[PDB]
Short mmCIF file of N, CA and C in Angstrom, two decimals:
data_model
loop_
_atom_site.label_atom_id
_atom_site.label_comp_id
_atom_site.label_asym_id
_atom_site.label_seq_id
_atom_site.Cartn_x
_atom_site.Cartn_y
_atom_site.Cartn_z
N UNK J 1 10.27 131.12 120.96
CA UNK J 1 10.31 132.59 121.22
C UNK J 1 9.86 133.35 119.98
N UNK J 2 8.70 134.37 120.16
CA UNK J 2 8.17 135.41 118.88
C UNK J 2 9.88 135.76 118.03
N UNK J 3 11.06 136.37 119.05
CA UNK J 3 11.67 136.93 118.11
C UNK J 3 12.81 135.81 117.54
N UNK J 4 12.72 134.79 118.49
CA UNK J 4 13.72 133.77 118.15
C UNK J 4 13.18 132.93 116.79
N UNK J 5 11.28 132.88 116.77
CA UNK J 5 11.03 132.31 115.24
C UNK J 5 11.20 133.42 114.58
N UNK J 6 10.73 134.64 114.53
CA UNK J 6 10.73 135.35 113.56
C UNK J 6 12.30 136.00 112.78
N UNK J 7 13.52 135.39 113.99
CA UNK J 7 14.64 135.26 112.83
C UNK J 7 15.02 134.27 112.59
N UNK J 8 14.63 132.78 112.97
CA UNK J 8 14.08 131.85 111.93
C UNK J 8 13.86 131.92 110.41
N UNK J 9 12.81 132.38 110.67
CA UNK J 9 12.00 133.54 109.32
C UNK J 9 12.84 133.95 108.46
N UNK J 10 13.70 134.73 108.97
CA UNK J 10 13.55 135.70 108.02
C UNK J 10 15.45 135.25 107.40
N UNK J 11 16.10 133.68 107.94
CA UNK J 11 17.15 133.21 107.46
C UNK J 11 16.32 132.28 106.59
N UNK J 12 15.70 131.72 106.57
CA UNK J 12 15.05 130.69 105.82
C UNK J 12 14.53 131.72 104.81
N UNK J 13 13.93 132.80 104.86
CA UNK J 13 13.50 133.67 103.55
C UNK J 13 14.72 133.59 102.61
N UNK J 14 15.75 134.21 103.32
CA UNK J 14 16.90 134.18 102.76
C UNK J 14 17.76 133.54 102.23
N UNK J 15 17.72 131.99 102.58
CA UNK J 15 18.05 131.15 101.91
C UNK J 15 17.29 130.44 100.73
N UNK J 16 15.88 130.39 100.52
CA UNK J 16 15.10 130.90 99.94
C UNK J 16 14.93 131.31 98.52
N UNK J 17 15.59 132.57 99.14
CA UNK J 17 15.78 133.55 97.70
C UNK J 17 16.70 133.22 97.05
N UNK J 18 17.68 132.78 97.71
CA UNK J 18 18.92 131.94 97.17
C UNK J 18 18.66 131.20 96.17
N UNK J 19 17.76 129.95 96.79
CA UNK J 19 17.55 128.87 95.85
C UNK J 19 16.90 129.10 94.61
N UNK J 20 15.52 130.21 94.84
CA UNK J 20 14.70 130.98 94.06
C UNK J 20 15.88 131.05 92.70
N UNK J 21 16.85 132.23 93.05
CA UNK J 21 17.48 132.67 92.24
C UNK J 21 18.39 131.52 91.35
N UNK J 22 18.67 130.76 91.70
CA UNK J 22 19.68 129.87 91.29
C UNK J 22 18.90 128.96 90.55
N UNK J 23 17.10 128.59 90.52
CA UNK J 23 16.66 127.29 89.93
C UNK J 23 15.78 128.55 88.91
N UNK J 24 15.83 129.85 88.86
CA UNK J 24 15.62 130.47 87.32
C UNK J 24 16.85 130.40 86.55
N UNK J 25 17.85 130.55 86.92
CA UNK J 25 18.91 130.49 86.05
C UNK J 25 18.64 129.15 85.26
N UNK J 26 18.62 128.20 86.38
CA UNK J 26 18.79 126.76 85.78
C UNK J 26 17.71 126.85 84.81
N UNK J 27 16.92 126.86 84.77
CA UNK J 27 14.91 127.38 83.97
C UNK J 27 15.40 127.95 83.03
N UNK J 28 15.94 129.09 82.93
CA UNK J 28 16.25 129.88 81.43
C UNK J 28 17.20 129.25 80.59
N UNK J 29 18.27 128.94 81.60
CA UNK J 29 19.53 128.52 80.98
C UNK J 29 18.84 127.07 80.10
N UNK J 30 18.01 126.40 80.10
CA UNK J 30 17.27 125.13 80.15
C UNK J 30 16.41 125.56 79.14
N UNK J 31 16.23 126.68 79.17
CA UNK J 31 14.87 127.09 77.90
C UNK J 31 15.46 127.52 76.81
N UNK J 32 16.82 128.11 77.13
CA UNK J 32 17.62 128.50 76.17
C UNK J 32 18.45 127.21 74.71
N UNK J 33 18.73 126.30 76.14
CA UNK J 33 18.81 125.42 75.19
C UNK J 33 18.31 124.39 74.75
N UNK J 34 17.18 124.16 74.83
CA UNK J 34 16.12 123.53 74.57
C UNK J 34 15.33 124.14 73.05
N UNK J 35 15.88 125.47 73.24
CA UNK J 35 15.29 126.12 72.07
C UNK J 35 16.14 126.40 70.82
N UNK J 36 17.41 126.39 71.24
CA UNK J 36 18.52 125.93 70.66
C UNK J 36 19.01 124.69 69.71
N UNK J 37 18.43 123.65 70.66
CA UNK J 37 18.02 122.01 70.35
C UNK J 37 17.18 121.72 69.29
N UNK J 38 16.17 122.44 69.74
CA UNK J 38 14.73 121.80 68.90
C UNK J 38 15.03 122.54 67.34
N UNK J 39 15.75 123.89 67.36
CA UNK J 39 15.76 124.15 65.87
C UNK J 39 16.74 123.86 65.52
N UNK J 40 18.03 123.11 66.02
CA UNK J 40 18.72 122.28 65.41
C UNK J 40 18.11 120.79 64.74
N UNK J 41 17.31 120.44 65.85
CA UNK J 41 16.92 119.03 64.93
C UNK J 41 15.90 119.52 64.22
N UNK J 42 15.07 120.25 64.00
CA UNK J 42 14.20 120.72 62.93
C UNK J 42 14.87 121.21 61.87
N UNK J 43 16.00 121.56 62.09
CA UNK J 43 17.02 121.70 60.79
C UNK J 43 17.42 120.48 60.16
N UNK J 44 18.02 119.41 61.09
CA UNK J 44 18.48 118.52 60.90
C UNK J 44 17.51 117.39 59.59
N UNK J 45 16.01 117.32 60.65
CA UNK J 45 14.95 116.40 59.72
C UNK J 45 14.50 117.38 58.23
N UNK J 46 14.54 118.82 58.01
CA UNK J 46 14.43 119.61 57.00
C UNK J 46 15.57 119.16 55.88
N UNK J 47 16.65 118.85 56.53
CA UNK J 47 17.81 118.57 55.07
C UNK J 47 17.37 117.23 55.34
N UNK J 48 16.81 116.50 56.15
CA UNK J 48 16.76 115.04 55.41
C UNK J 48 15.31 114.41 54.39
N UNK J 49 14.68 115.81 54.88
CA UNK J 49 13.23 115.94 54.19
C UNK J 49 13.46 116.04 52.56
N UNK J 50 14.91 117.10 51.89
CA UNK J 50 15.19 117.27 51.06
C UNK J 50 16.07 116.47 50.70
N UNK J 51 16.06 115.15 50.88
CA UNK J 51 17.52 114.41 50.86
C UNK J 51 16.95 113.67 49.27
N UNK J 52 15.34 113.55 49.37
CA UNK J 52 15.12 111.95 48.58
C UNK J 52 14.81 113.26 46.96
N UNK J 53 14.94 114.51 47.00
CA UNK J 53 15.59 114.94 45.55
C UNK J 53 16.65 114.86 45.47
N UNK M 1 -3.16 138.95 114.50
CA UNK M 1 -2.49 138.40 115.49
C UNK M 1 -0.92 137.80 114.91
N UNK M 2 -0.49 139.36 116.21
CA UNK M 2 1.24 138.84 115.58
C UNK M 2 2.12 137.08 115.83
N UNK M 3 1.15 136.13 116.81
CA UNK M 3 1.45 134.68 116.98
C UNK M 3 1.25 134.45 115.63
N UNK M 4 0.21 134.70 115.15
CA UNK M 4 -1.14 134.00 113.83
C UNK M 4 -0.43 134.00 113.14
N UNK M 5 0.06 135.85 113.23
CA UNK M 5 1.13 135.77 111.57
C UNK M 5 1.89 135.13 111.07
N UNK M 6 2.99 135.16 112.54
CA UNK M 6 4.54 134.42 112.29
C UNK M 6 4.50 132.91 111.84
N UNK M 7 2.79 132.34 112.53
CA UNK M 7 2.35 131.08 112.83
C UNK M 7 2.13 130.87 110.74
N UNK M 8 1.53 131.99 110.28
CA UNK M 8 0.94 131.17 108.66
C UNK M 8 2.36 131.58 108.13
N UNK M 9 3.04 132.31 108.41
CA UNK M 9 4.49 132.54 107.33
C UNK M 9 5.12 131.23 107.74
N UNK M 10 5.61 130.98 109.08
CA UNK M 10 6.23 129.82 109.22
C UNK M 10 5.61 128.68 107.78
N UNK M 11 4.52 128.62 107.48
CA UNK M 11 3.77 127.79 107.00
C UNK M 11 4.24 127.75 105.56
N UNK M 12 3.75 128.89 105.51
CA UNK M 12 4.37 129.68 103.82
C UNK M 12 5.87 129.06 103.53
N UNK M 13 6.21 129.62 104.27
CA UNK M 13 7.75 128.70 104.38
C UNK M 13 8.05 127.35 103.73
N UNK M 14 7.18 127.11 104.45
CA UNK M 14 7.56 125.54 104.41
C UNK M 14 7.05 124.58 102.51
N UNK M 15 6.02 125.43 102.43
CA UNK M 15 5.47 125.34 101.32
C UNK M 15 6.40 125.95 99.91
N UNK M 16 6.73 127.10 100.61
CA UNK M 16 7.65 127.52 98.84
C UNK M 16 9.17 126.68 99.40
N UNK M 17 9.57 126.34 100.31
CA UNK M 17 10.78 125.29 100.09
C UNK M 17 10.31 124.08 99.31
N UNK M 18 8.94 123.46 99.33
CA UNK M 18 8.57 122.41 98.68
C UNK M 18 8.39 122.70 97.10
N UNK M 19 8.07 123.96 96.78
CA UNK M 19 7.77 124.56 95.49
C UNK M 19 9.49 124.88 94.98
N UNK M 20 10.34 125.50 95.59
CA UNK M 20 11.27 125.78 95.26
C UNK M 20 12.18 124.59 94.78
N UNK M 21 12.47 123.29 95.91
CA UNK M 21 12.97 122.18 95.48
C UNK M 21 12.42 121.38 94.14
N UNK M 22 11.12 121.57 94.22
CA UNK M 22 10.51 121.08 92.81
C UNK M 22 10.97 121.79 91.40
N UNK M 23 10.81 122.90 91.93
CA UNK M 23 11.39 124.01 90.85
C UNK M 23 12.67 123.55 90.25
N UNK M 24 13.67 122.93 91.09
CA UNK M 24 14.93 122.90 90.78
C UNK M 24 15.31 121.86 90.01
N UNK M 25 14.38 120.61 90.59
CA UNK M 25 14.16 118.94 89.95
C UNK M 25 13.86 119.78 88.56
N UNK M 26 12.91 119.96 87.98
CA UNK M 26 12.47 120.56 86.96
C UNK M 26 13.41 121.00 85.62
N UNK M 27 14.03 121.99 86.84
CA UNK M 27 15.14 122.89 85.70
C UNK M 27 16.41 121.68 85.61
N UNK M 28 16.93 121.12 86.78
CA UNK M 28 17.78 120.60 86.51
C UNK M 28 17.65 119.50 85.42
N UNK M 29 16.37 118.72 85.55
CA UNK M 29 16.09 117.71 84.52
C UNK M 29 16.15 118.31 83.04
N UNK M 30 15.79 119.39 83.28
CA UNK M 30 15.45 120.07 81.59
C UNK M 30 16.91 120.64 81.31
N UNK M 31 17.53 121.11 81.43
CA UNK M 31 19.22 121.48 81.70
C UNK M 31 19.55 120.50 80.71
N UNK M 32 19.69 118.70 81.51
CA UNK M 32 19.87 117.66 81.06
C UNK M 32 19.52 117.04 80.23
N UNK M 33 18.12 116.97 79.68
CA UNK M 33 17.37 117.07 78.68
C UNK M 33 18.08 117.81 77.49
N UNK M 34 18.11 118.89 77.84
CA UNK M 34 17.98 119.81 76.66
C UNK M 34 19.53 119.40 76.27
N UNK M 35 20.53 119.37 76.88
CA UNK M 35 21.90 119.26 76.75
C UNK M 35 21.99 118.00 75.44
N UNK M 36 21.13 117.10 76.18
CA UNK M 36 21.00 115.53 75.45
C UNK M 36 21.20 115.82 73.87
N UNK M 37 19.74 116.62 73.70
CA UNK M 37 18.86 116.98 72.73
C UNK M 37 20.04 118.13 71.59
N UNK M 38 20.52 118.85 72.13
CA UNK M 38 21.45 119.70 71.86
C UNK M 38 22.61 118.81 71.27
N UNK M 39 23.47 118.08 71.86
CA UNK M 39 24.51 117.05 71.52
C UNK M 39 23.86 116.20 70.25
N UNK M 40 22.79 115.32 71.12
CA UNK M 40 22.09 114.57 69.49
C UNK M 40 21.56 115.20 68.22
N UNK M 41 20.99 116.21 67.87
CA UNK M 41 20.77 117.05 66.69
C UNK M 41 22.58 117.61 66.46
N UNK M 42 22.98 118.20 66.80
CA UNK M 42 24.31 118.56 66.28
C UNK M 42 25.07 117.66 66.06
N UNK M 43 25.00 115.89 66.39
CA UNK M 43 25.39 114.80 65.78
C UNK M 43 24.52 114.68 64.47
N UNK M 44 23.48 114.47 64.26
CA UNK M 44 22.25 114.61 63.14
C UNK M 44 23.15 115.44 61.99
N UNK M 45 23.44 116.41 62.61
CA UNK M 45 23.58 117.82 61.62
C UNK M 45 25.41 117.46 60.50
N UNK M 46 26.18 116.74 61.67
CA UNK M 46 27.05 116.20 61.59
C UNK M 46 27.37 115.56 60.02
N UNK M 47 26.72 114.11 60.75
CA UNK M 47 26.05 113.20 59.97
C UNK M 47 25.69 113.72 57.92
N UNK M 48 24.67 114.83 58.07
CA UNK M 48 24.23 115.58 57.28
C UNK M 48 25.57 115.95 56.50
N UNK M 49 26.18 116.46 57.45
CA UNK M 49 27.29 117.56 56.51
C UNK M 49 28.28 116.61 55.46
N UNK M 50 28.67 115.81 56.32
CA UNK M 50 29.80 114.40 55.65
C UNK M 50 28.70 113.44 54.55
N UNK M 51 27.78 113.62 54.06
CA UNK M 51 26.81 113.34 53.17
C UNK M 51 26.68 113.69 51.80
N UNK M 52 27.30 115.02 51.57
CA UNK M 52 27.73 115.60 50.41
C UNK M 52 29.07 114.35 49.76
N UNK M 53 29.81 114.09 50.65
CA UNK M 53 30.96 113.56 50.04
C UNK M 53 30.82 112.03 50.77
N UNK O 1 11.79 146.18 115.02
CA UNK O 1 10.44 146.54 115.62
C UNK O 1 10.01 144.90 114.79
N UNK O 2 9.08 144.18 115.79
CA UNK O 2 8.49 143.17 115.74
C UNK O 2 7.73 142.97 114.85
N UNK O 3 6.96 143.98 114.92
CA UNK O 3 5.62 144.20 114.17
C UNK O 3 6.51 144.56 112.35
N UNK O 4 7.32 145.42 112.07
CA UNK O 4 7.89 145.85 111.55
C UNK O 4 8.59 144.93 110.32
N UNK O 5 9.04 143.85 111.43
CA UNK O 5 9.96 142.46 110.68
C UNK O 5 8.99 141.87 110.03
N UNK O 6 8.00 141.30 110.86
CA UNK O 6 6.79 140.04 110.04
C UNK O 6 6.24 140.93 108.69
N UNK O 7 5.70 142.48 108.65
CA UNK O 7 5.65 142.73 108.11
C UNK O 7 6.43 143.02 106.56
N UNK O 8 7.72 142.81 106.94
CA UNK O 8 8.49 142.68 105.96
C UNK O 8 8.90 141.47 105.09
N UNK O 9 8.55 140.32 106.17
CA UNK O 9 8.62 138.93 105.99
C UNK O 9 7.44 138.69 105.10
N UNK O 10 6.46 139.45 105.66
CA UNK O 10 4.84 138.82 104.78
C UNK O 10 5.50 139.50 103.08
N UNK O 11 5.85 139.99 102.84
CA UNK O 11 6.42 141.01 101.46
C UNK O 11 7.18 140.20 100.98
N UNK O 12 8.17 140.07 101.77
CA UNK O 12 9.59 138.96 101.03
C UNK O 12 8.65 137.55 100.42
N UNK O 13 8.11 137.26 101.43
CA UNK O 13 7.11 136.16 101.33
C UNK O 13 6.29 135.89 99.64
N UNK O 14 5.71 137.29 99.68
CA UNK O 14 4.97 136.96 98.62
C UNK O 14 5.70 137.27 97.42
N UNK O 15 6.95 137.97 97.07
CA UNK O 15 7.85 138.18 96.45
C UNK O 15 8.35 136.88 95.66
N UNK O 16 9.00 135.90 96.57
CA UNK O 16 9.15 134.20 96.82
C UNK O 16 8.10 133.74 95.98
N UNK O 17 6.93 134.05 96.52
CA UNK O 17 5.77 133.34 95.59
C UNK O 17 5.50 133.38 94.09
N UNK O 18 5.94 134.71 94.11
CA UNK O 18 5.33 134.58 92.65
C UNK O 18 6.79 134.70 91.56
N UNK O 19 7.93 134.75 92.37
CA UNK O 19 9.79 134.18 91.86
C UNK O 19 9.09 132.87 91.53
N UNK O 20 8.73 131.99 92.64
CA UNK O 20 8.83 130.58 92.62
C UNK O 20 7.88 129.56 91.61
N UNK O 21 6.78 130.76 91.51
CA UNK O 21 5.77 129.95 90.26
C UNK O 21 6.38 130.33 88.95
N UNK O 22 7.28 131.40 88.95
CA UNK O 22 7.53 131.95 87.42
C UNK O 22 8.71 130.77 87.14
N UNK O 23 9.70 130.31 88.28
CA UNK O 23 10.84 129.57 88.09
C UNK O 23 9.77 128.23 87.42
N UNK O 24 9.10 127.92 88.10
CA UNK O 24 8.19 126.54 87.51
C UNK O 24 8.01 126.57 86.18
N UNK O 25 7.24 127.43 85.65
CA UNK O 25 6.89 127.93 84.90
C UNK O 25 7.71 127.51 83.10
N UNK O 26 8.85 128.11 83.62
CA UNK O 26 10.12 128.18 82.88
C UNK O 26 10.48 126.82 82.92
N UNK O 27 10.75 126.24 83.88
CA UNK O 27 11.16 125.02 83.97
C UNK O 27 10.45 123.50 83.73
N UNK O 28 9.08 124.22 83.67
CA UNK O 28 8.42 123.07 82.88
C UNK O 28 7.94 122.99 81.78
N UNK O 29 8.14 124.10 81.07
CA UNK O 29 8.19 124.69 79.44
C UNK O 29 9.75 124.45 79.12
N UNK O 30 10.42 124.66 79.90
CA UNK O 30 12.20 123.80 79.39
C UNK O 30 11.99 122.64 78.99
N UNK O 31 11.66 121.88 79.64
CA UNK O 31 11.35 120.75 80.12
C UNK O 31 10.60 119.83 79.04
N UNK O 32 9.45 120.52 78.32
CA UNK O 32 8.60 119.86 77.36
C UNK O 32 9.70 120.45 76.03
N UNK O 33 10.29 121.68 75.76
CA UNK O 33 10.59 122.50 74.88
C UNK O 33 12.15 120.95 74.62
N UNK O 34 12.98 120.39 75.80
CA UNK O 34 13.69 119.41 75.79
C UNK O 34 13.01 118.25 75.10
N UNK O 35 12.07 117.84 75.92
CA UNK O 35 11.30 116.26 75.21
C UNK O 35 11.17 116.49 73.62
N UNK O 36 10.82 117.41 73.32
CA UNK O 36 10.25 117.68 71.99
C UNK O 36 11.86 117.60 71.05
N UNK O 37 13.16 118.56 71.57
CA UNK O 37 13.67 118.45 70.67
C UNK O 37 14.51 117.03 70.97
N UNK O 38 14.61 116.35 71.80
CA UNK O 38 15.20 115.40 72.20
C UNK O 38 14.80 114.18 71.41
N UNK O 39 13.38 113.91 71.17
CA UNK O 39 12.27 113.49 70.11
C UNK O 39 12.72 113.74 68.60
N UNK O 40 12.75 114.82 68.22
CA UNK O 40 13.63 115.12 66.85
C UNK O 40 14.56 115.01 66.33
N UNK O 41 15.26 115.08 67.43
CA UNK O 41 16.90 114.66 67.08
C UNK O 41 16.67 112.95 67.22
N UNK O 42 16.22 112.25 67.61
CA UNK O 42 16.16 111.08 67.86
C UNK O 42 15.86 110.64 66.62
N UNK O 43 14.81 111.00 65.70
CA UNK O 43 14.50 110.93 64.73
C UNK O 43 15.06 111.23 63.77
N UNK O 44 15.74 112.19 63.61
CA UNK O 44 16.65 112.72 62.26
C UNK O 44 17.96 111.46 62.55
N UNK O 45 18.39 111.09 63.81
CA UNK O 45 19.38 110.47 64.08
C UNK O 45 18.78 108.95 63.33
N UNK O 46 17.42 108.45 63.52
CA UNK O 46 17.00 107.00 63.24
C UNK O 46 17.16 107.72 61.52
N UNK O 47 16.39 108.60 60.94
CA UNK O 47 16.64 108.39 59.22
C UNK O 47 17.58 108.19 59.08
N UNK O 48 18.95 108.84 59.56
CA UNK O 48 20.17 109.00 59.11
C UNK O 48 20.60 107.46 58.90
N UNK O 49 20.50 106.83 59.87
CA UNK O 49 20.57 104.87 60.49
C UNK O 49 20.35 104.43 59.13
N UNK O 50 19.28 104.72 58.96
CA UNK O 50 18.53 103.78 57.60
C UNK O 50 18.76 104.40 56.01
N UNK O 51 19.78 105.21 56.08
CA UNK O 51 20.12 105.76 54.79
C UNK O 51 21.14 105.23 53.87
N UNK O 52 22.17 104.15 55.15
CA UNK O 52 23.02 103.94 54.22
C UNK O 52 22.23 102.32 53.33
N UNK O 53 21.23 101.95 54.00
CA UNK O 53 20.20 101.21 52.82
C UNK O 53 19.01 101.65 52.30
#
């Protein structure tokens, strides 16, 4: 049925957006600490860079 | 053609659920990743600190 | 109105689309931004190994 797919449609959009929304969080939250990470261990190999004075 | 339409969104559909689930593999892996990465440098850093003495 | 909905659907639609490439996006720049520091810390963790000889 036209209107029986088209609210099909428009629950599947909606769930959708759901997921949309929930796998940027995961993405930022993920970039955040990733970026977090990397200048910790770039800290980490920097004091061991200065270790052999 | 309002069939045509409902007919390529249905489609669309189906395609950003495949993009969206990927999306999520992605973030979730990097989440995990980064967490790893995060824990192991702040062991590194650890390590570092108890080095003085 | 029929016409009214799809039309709103085609919008949500492309809305989705370009949410869903930006979530990628993010999540596969997490993703490398992880390997990389996951890589470093691995490394500051192996000098540390070989310091006490």
């Amino acid at each position: 049925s036209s209107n029986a797919k088209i609210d099909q449609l428009s629950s599947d959009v909606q769930t959708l957006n759901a997921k949309v929304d929930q796998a940027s969080n995961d993405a930022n939250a993920a970039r955040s600490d990733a970026q977090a990470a990397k200048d910790d261990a770039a800290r980490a190999n920097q004091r061991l860079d200065n270790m052999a004075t």
